[PDB]
Symmetry: D2
Subunit: 266 residues, 4 copies
């Protein structure tokens, strides 16, 4: 009688899809995504690095903003990721096809990216995107260097098994600024306790809060800017209310502890 | 001002998603998909073969019908495909996870399946599904045998580069019936002439019409039953109006020639 | 003048390639590899599991011993691995082609297996084997069940990033025996300190010694039987001198500490 | 009693491993491989293309010759292949890691490259190399353009299913020269007739001879220079005795016909 349900698209708040002009974060580092999704362009003498790309439909916008910054498609050398969900790695496959970029990621992120976010530990097949391959597998603490800028990977599993914080030192008019691009610490709708697909989930989150607290962190950014209290829409004041890494980890742990207590109740 | 567009789901006619009970095609062969999408179960002494699975959301229905036929999940040994579009290979990844099945397919089908139908030559990223890996690569004319039933692959590129017809001989109360499961010969919205992503498209279709004409073909079935004039909803009369392979290829070539003439006009 | 060097084969001690008849370890568990490489067959009512396969050239021998145990190729349901080096995962690709088996492994093991052991963190391309794909990705502590026998994964990174101990409870004439198949803890020729390809190597080994100490462990086996003092060549006395998990971890840590001190010296 | 055999390395004639300085073929095109294996560097205003790399151990030599030509590792934009055997695609994985290059290849070549030449239709696992992934899948007749130089793919299956001829137009002091890099047409030790792994092998070779005859072909080069009568070791006279595409196809077909007759005899 009833047919099987139609496929449902992954739809998001309009602000996550609202294009913005490039916003300078430090001397070499620019936010080039949307008002509510981070995509960081780091420009060096020997090419550019992109950290995250946002949603699948953002590929053209990212290339447009790269061109505004003077980065031709072939000048993009490397793509790094916070984690391989559709709202952060969405356009990676298309960006690889349209640029000279390689992708570097840890093994967990590589296997999730290669299945386009399908068979997610918590989302199943509900939130997917075009698959892409990682060209370089990185280990915890490994340094990736482009044009002399060194990016250090800090694994912080929990939100995904492959969740990664990336740190690098830029300058603000020549003076060092230690940037920490810390991954999400949310657990949206997750089963936290006794999860057969992620048995050590709680232990991983708890260690990840400590990892984030200890990051070198003059300036924190996050894949969802609201998580670190950034306001990309207000330009020069965008960073004014930004959290420290310590405060971001503390807020995330308090939310996590409350969610765990509610799960025990329900 | 305007945000980027939301992602759009691949939605289809309700009849493509309308479950049906198993319909016997020959002694060992059953249609177990929906009223308007073919999924053929061939049952042998040494396990079962599935030819196509339909849409991604059909995985549970297929397993239900397998159980009605006496095929436990671990009894499914092999998945074969007509072509790797979402409406025929949709549930392959999930079926592999939930059964003991391997997938056998040609290289073109394997590479399209492995990217979940993304970066399609004609559809781009508009019609995708969870990626799956082929476990065995097959060549044109290669025979795959399960439980003594021999399935022969006949490449018929055009609708996709990897489009394949599968033939086998079943029985009807012990008497031989040469079954031809011929792939689609449609070109829905395709640019046929001077296509930079498929320069020899017209030559491939034209050869594929000839391939289909020559198939051993007592009984023709097609991924979309309407293409061969099957009527799955009427049970015992389902095959009554079915086309021959010759008539199917002729109708497809006439449609193709008309579409090519219209493309030249527009 | 001098040509580039010829490729060099991965050659091993003859005892690693010396076939042996199946040796019973417990009611359902058999050593079916060679005198000096472990390959464990666990036989259940609903099919068999293979833990490791040894060297690439052992595939036929493994299938022979499976047949002696009553396991037809299609009865092999699952392959599990200690780690994805050529002397333990060597024949996995061929076994998958010749049996109905899937492979389950963590993400690190999956990415190393998929490149056939090439670009190894320590061996480069010197020790490789035919690539294979993991069909199921498992997380730390995840339970995989076949025929009612539950196998629990315990990650113990160091020898490879994906190194895994597998535990299960068998019986000895109906009485429970907790088997621990603990991975290698060696670091043959490895740079341990300040390794840019594995920055947290020492921390991972140190945690892995503790993981092995805590395993449920009535009977310890290891990929190289000599590491746990097994003597496969003497049949019924093969397990007589076997180490406990505690003693295996202690011996490995003492060796590791000495090697680290020598590396600091040299 | 007897242990299983040791693994055997793929060893080749010394001349295949004999490094040579870059040899100019046309204004933009250089032979940069060894005396007996072709590796063509095409240098454009917008980066370089490499067609084949030879044996796995040639990676460093190729990078050295690129540097002599003024091509830094990051200037290599694209790798194209004749076919994915160890003596032509051997160093592709390492070159991708050490350069900015992507690989473009047809689906058949991509699936063979991704398993490192293992499970070869004729060689089994005897001739393998580190696996690499194709970043772009190309179709027959598709044009790939770098720095304004257009490379056209011409499929010529037989030696491998994915065998490809690549054509482009260079200049000799400004005057057009149509270069044809035609793949191997040998069948070394192959079973040609009734091959269950390649049922249409003879038909594919026969069509491939015709494909090679029709190539735009002012100057023919081949993966093994001896096949087209090149003499890389004599510098300026290297091309003097080179065959036409017509003569290369004719010689290959005569050899093929004789081998087929001998196979029928034996
Ligand atoms: C909690 C979210 C912001 S929700 C979004 C995603 N699911 C829905 O879009 C999940 O993951 N991403 C999360 C995040 O990165 O924090
Ligand atoms: C023309 C169609 C029936 S349409 C559907 C698909 N696109 C839309 O669903 C394409 O492909 N499949 C075709 C087919 O297989 O013949
Ligand atoms: C130290 C070894 C026994 S050596 C061998 C391998 N390299 C040489 O064959 C490495 O790995 N496997 C080690 C092991 O598993 O303990
Ligand atoms: C006949 C060969 C020159 S032999 C070599 C290879 N097998 C041995 O090295 C095969 O393939 N490559 C052939 C070729 O490309 O023509
Ligand atoms: O790398 C040390 C550096 O990090 C900062 C924050 O940028 O301090 C963080 O790290 C310290 C050691 O891990 C912690 O004591 C501190 O709580 C944490 O914020 C800088 O203060 C310090 O120079
Ligand atoms: O979610 C952060 C994102 O929201 C915007 C509005 O689109 O700013 C809001 O959130 C900021 C804190 O994260 C507030 O300071 C601001 O007042 C509020 O409008 C974006 O600008 C910001 O990137
Ligand atoms: O395999 C031959 C077999 O096929 C049939 C149809 O089932 O005929 C088809 O193939 C013939 C040769 O390819 C064609 O002459 C014919 O037009 C085509 O239908 C049977 O008639 C025949 O026994
Ligand atoms: O598209 C074929 C598919 O449509 C159904 C109705 O759901 O049957 C229709 O098409 C048949 C020919 O293909 C007609 O004979 C029939 O009268 C018409 O309703 C399905 O039954 C059939 O599988
Ligand atoms: O799972 C507990 C079980 O393991 C054994 C060994 O088989 O003890 C091991 O684990 C204990 C807790 O992790 C440790 O105290 C002990 O040192 C270690 O050997 C059994 O004794 C126990 O029943
Ligand atoms: O390396 C273990 C492996 O070696 C053999 C001989 O081939 O046995 C040796 O090692 C045993 C301890 O691991 C000793 O007890 C034995 O005396 C010695 O010969 C194999 O039997 C064993 O599997
Ligand atoms: O593309 C035509 C061009 O190719 C040449 C050889 O470079 O001729 C080849 O192709 C012709 C048509 O395919 C054949 O007639 C000829 O035999 C073959 O060598 C040039 O002669 C011609 O300009
Ligand atoms: O196999 C071709 C390859 O061999 C060399 C010698 O290393 O040259 C030989 O083959 C040429 C024809 O292909 C002959 O003309 C030459 O006289 C002979 O030495 C290499 O120079 C050539 O690249
Ligand atoms: Zn400045
Ligand atoms: Zn997320
Ligand atoms: Zn998110
Ligand atoms: Zn019957
Ligand atoms: Zn289709
Ligand atoms: Zn369809
Ligand atoms: Zn018993
Ligand atoms: Zn090892
Ligand atoms: Zn080992
Ligand atoms: Zn010049
Ligand atoms: Zn070859
Ligand atoms: Zn060759």
């Amino acid at each position: 009688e009833a047919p099987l349900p139609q496929l449902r698209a992954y739809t998001v708040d309009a602000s996550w899809l609202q294009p913005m002009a490039p916003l300078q974060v430090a001397d070499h580092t620019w936010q080039i995504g949307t008002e509510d999704l981070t995509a960081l362009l780091v420009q060096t003498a020997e090419g550019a690095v992109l950290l995250d790309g946002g949603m699948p439909q953002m590929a053209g916008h990212l290339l447009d903003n790269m061109k505004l910054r003077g980065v031709a498609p072939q000048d993009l050398r490397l793509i790094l990721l916070s984690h391989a969900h559709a709202d952060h790695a969405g356009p990676v496959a298309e960006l690889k096809r349209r640029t000279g970029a390689h992708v570097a990621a840890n093994a967990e992120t590589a296997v999730l990216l290669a299945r386009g976010g399908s068979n997610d530990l918590h989302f199943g097949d509900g939130i997917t995107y075009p698959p892409a391959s990682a060209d370089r597998i990185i280990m915890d603490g490994e340094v990736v260097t482009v044009g002399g800028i060194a990016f250090t990977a800090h694994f912080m599993p929990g939100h995904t098994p492959g969740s990664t914080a990336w740190t690098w030192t830029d300058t603000r008019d020549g003076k060092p600024v230690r940037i920490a691009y810390a991954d999400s610490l949310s657990a949206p709708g997750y089963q936290l306790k006794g999860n057969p697909r992620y048995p050590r989930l709680i232990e991983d989150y708890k260690r990840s809060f400590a990892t984030v607290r200890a990051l070198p962190c003059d300036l924190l950014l996050t894949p969802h800017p609201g998580a670190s209290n950034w306001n990309y829409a207000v330009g020069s004041k965008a960073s004014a209310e930004a959290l420290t890494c310590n405060a971001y980890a503390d807020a995330a742990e308090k939310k996590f502890d409350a969610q765990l207590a509610r799960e025990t109740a329900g």
